[PDB]
Amino acid sequence: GLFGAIAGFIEGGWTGMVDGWYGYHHQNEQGSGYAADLKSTQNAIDGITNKVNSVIEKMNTQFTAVGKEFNHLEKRIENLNKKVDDGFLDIWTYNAELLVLLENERTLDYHDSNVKNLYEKVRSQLKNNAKEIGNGCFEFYHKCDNTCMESVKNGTYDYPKYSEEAKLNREEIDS
Amino acid sequence: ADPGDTLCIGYHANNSTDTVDTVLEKNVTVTHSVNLLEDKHNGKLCKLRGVAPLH
């Protein structure tokens, strides 16, 4: 992947998470489960929807009858007509094929970028209060209940609130 | 108190077998996709602009 998250340091996808494209798995004393980050998912769904509509709706054609009829003494203009139909066929086929090829690659990179930014948003929030244990997972140095978990997902994690407890537990763990 | 509790960042997957092509790779299975190529017709001659044809 272009950004390294999908099929990268996050190795696989979650069939268990069904309500969103990008989300979270959590586990605390209150239990575990999957949840989807609604903001990032809806932003990506809006973006891709706009992309598909842009590809479709920018093609606005008028009423037209492609066919033409020529008699046996009009072979040259008949071939001229064929060249026009063929040239348009070649232009549209090649352009359509490459547009799908190139934009499909951009779409998968887009998802890869969205995952990386989501991981980095959390990592920049938790800082040293949690450990980066790989596969997109953070292991906390302080207890993080459901309310604390939602604050991380909401982008409102209070680092100073838990920094002292995490610091003491981190030093004890490392010692 | 004790440390612990984990949070993980991940992405969706499903049982989809839809394959698309990309500039770098062919037959990449994806979770969702749409078709831009109409390849079906109703097999009938019909009325343009509401008006029937002359047969």
Epitope: Q27, S32, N135, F140 | -
Partner: antibody
Framework: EVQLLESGGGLVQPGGSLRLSCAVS????????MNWVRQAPGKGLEWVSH????????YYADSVKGRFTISRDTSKNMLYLQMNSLRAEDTAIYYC?????????????????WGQGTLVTVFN | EIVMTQSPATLSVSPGERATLSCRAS??????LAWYQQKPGQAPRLLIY???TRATGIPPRFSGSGSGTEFSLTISSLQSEDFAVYYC??????????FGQGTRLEIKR
């Protein structure tokens, strides 16, 4: 082969303390999370405690919170269970269970290998 | 806590026959369900993980199925070694990890 050996069980009065040891051999200890599961005499199974491969995360059953403590020494291939404030209802056979998977938190909670267990009796 | 109910408590059927076990959950646990076997005097052994995948060394005669709240375990040809107690356990919302009360398979004579 993978071997899990329990020890440290025995008789004790209520309010006493015991410490279990799970001897680990046959796999990379650091890669896998460990658990304690107990079974009352002639009864069903009951999960007790869990510790992650790293050791930072621990989870406990509600009835043993504040009394039991799970720990590991990865360099020595050892898993421990320190029980304080023991109760008569804690009388059971205690097994240490290895998690069947490594590096997938969302797919943990499955025990592929169990030791034969050790017995803790707390009568009065 | 996800309560696990495992009926019938005791099931009677002859060797070589087929036995169906049921596991019910108070809440959906998706496919994060396991099955365990415990012969008398021995530690529990893992049979099924993911509610349908057999573990290493599990012979093909053991079948697992289900999702959500209703689950089942099937032994196609029942041999005398398999007359034991079977437990079901969820790992979809824990802690706590919860087991069912188990089912005893008795030989019919």
């Amino acid at each position: 082969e993978v071997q899990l050996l329990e020890s440290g069980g025995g008789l004790v009065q209520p309010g006493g303390s015991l410490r279990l040891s799970c001897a680990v051999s046959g796999f990379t200890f650091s890669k896998y999370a460990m658990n304690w599961v107990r079974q009352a005499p002639g009864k069903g199974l009951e999960w007790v405690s869990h510790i992650s491969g790293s050791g930072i995360s621990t989870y406990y059953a509600d009835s043993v919170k504040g009394r039991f403590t799970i720990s590991r020494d990865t360099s020595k291939n050892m898993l421990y269970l320190q029980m304080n404030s023991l109760r008569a209802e804690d009388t059971a056979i205690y097994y240490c269970a290895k998690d069947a998977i490594s590096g997938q938190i969302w797919l943990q909670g499955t025990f592929d290998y169990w030791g034969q267990g050790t017995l803790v009796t707390v009568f009065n | 806590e996800i309560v696990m109910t495992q009926s019938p408590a005791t099931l009677s059927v002859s060797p070589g026959e087929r036995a169906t076990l049921s596991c019910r959950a108070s809440q959906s646990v998706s496919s994060n369900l396991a099955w365990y076997q415990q012969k008398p005097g021995q530690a529990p052994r893992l049979l099924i993980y993911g509610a349908s995948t057999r573990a290493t060394g599990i012979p093909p005669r053991f079948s697992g199925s289900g999702s959500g709240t209703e689950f089942s375990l099937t032994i196609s040809s029942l041999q005398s070694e398999d007359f034991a107690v079977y437990y079901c356990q969820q790992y979809n919302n824990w802690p706590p990890i919860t087991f069912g009360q188990g089912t005893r398979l008795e030989i019919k004579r």
